[PDB]
Amino acid sequence: MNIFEMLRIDEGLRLKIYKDTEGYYTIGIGHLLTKSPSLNAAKSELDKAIGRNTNGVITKDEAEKLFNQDVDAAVRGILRNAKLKPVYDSLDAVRRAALINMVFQMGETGVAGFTNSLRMAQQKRWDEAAVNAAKSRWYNQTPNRAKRVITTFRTGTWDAYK
């Protein structure tokens, strides 16, 4: 199992523009298109991302392409963030995946704010940090996902995804 498989489960796969839980235009595999309410803006952003006149519909391959860029972006953003890099560098690979997962979902910014958990995770005190991560809007809005991630994080295993 891996991050690709992992995130493919949390995000799903849609080929036609959709609104997420938060109500934003999105498509593919968790590829946020726009925070704006204009479906056109969304189409525009779509077209601009794909490089063609999509008319809000994409193909599997395109979705996948977005996904790769997005993952690769997440990995890179982590490595370039001073708050995060180190953390990342200390974790094993399973946990890294978890980290990546959250960055993918909430951005380098929204994640940099789990300072308290993160610093705990830095010390390797799993249970502690987990509970703390839970005391969050994140956790409250998308409990099931959040749970899969915090479990993974804490366990360093993939149990929550089988």
* Binding site, annotated residues for substrate: 32, 104, 117, 132
Nearest approach in angstroms of CB 79 to Cl ion is 19
Here's the x/- map for Cl ion, 74-113, by CB under 5 A: it reads as: ----------------------------------------
Residues 4/71, Cβ–Cβ less than 8 Å: yes
Which residue matches tokens 């969050």? 136
Instruction: Name the residue type at position 153.
Output: F
Among 43, 145, 148, 154, binds Cl ion (CB under 5 A): 145
CB under 8 Å to 162, separation ≥6 — which residues? 1
Nearest approach in angstroms of CB 8 to Cl ion is 15
72 is catalytic: no
- The residues that bridge with 27 in the sheet, in sequence order, are 31
Q: Which of these is catalytic: 5, 10, 11, 128?
A: 11
| CB closer to Cl ion, 95 vs 145 | 145
Among 49, 94, 120, 130, binds Cl ion (CB under 5 A): 49
Q: Which residue's CB atom is positioned nearest to Cl ion?
A: 142
136 touches Cl ion (CB under 5 A): no
11 is catalytic: yes
Which residue matches tokens 């997440």? 74
Chain residues binding Cl ion by CB under 5 A are 49, 142, 144-145
